From Swiss-Prot, chain B:
EC identifiers of the protein: 3.6.1.13, 3.6.1.58, 2.7.7.96
Protein's organism: Homo sapiens
Gene coding for it: NUDT5
GO molecular function, one term: nucleotidyltransferase activity
Protein name per Swiss-Prot or TrEMBL: ADP-sugar pyrophosphatase
Cofactor descriptive note: Binds 3 Mg(2+) ions per subunit.
UniProt subcellular location: Nucleus
Keyword Ubl conjugation applies: yes
Modified positions (Phosphothreonine) in chain numbering: T32
Keyword Ribosomal protein: no
Length: 194, 194
């Protein structure tokens, strides 16, 4: 019933562009939408985000998160490890790779979502959410070695899965960070379950 | 350590703008980023809300109430939590209840309200409050819920059981071209993981 008629370029950066989308509304009237797209997509999706479950015997199961300065936000954010999928990379391989670079952990793939939208009223950005388990008792994850690329500066924050929401709220209150909406959504559902 | 040095406007549509962001990296070196912002944020503590609406009815399993609509940035239909921007002077809770009623017909009760969470913080400064609302589906008000969509709004309601949310989402993606939102998928994944 609704569909895109045309896309007009408004402005194109190196990494992001702004378009004016013309579309057919369900009444049969033509309407416009200002949209954002990345210039980097090739791929199943733009990026991956990793839900890393750190499993150590005789310890609570932790979710491994990252804290970074985010220039669009003007501040620090707490997020699932994540990055864009390299040209001709699978989402799983991007997931294990980004997890290693950002955290130093070597994980195993548990499951992989279909491409999911980030902010669909604003952009076409999509990611695969990849659930990964980390055997924290293996020697490779003893002294995990994070390999930041140029200009990446990432802090690792592991939080217990069984209290995640309350721990995130604490960091927000105490550290004036912004929690990521996907992280928060995950944390809410852990409390809402059953 | 890191902070914004300058924000230069590149292009300003009516709804969105693109900015060249200059910031100080933690080595003391000046770097740039291409940033997206909305033009609509005034004194709201966030751009928008998204509502987690838990529909509760005697002798029923709890449902999560979702909406499906065409998203011109995505060029297709998306399944999302009910959501909208916060009107000037409106509280996040009022916005949540109002959007829920407009989009679904249901009259909810506030349960909890998150702090401002970021939508896609490597791309944009956009933020939302995630507002959990219970819907008493045994109340007469909520028996024959009719969407009251605004101008150019065309929303379908999809209520799915909480106890099978992920598989029911998978079954919808399997049967048609449609993208699930990353917050909804994250929430459904945690419901499984718990
Ligand atoms: C910022 C994403 N664009 C919009 O919200 C919009 C609304 N009408 N036209 N474009
Ligand atoms: Cl798991
Ligand atoms: Mg990253
Ligand atoms: Mg990277
Ligand atoms: Mg909406
Ligand atoms: Mg609306």
């Amino acid at each position: 019933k609704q569909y895109i008629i045309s896309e007009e370029l408004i402005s194109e950066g190196k990494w992001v562009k702004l378009e004016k989308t013309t579309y057919m509304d369900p009444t049969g009237k033509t309407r416009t939408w200002e949209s954002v797209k990345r210039t980097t997509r090739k791929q199943t999706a733009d990026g991956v985000a990793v839900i890393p479950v750190l499993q150590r015997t005789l310890h609570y199961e932790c979710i491994v998160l990252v804290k970074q300065f985010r220039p669009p936000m003007g501040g620090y954010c707490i997020e699932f490890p994540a990055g864009l999928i390299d040209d001709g990379e699978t989402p799983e391989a991007a997931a294990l790779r980004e997890l290693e670079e950002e955290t130093g952990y070597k994980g195993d793939i548990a499951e992989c979502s279909p491409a999911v939208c980030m902010d669909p009223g604003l952009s076409n950005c999509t990611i695969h959410i990849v659930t990964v388990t980390i055997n924290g008792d293996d020697a490779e994850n003893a002294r995990p070695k994070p390999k930041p690329g140029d200009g990446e500066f990432v802090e690792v924050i592991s939080l217990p899965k069984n209290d995640l929401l309350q721990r995130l709220d604490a960091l927000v209150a105490e550290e004036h960070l912004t929690v990521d909406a996907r992280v928060y959504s995950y944390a809410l559902a852990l409390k809402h379950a059953n």
